[PDB]
Design a protein around this ligand. Structure first.
Ligand SMILES: [Mg+2]
Ligand SMILES: [Mg+2]
Ligand SMILES: [Mg+2]
Lengths: 75, 75, 73, 73, 74, 77, 76, 73
């Protein structure tokens, strides 16, 4: 029910989780914001189709990171 | 069937249309952006459940406008 | 309402905001990093009933009022 | 003061802001493109004297309150 | 010469042209800026490997536009 | 007596001290009007000096403008 | 010459505004001080350096880079 | 790579970016209204293979380099 799930820690030191049903839903979210609220927040967990990707970096860099991964291998 | 459709004119003087499946999806998109790309753009058409609302304003003001409306009148 | 400000937004619609006191206005200036209306042209600025001859953006009102002598109104 | 919010700023000092009504709070949210305090952690959020159990940033308060059934207070 | 050429009109009504040696250079500029100075400026010409793409939009929308096009036909 | 009416020292994100000076109060006010957002606005102030007097200020660079406006500075003339 | 740099631009209310800098270094410090300058996207009606009208066509924000690329020594 | 800059981002990781010339760097500064890394601490700054004694944020590198006589190198 959720291809992409992202957990990050916000400036109040609380965990927040956002999900996207498809990859295209994630792309639309990136295109919609001039600046995302969470763009500078460290990512605690990035999962794609249930697979944990070993991502280290900010929420804002996820978009670029995803494009350079071979994603078809996750089924 | 999209519940919300918004057409606005961007800085290239081109009409752009975005859609949301639920009010919740629209609210989430508002919460996600520190600043939305389209927030200062004039709205050409705001449609809710197939009804054209009589909306004269910017994209960024839609959220506050919709919250003051009784949307139960639209079916 | 001690201060009333009318401006034109990017959809070319008139909008009006009011502040009950000068301190309410000051507080709204300190509260935003950027005000939504900061770059909007001002059509009318009213101080205690008086139409001030103001020509400029919403964001410039604060510095304008600071330099004026308001005790005469 | 129906709404009172205490938060910690970037100099590590506590600051408090108050809103006389929920509608005054809504107006302040609508007024700023970005609020100065939006990324500051909230130390206390009170509503009609009730200490709400809020854990989050100042900028997330608006969406939080919108979700709560405040009538219980 | 340059794989990507972009001409836009700035707020002084002057035409400005920027160029990128490769698509990856263009991608690097996009990732580097939180906000690019030209992002809201209308594009008058977008050229890819010498070919005028029929692009109608802002500078800021070019990246997503390019990502969706099949570029190996130029 | 003092070259600059306003001197401000703050700590940036690299944890280094930066000092800016304003020859007059008007120069400072002009600088506040000229920036939509100032680079240093969220930085803590380590020292705020007005006409050579270290004011006992605790806050961000961005909040100096409002602080000064509310102070009675007549005691410094 | 009163001020080394004089800039007139048109703000969003379509009014002419003029700012001056006594020295080039004052002008540089003002460009370092703002993350974003209020006037950066405003069109420039006149740019005067040491009393000389420069033939400047552009936005306020681009002046800094324009001046850095010019040989301004002819104006000394 | 004539200019090499290592900084630390919102997540102590180090990242390195390079520019082929001073002119290339200058163009990169003109192109962003705000650079993603502008507030990040610089851990190393190299010009033509020489480590410069730079203590500051990424965003302040430009004003630092502009004041140096780089022909020395
Ligand atoms: Mg400010
Ligand atoms: Mg971004
Ligand atoms: Mg490069």
């Amino acid at each position: 029910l959720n291809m992409i799930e992202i957990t990050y820690i916000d400036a109040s030191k609380n965990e927040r989780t956002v999900t996207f049903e498809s990859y295209e839903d994630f792309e639309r979210s990136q295109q919609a914001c001039l600046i995302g609220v969470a763009d500078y927040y460290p990512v605690q967990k990035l999962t794609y189709k249930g697979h944990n990707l070993d991502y280290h970096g900010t929420y804002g860099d996820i978009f670029f990171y995803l494009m350079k991964q071979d994603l078809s291998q996750y089924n």
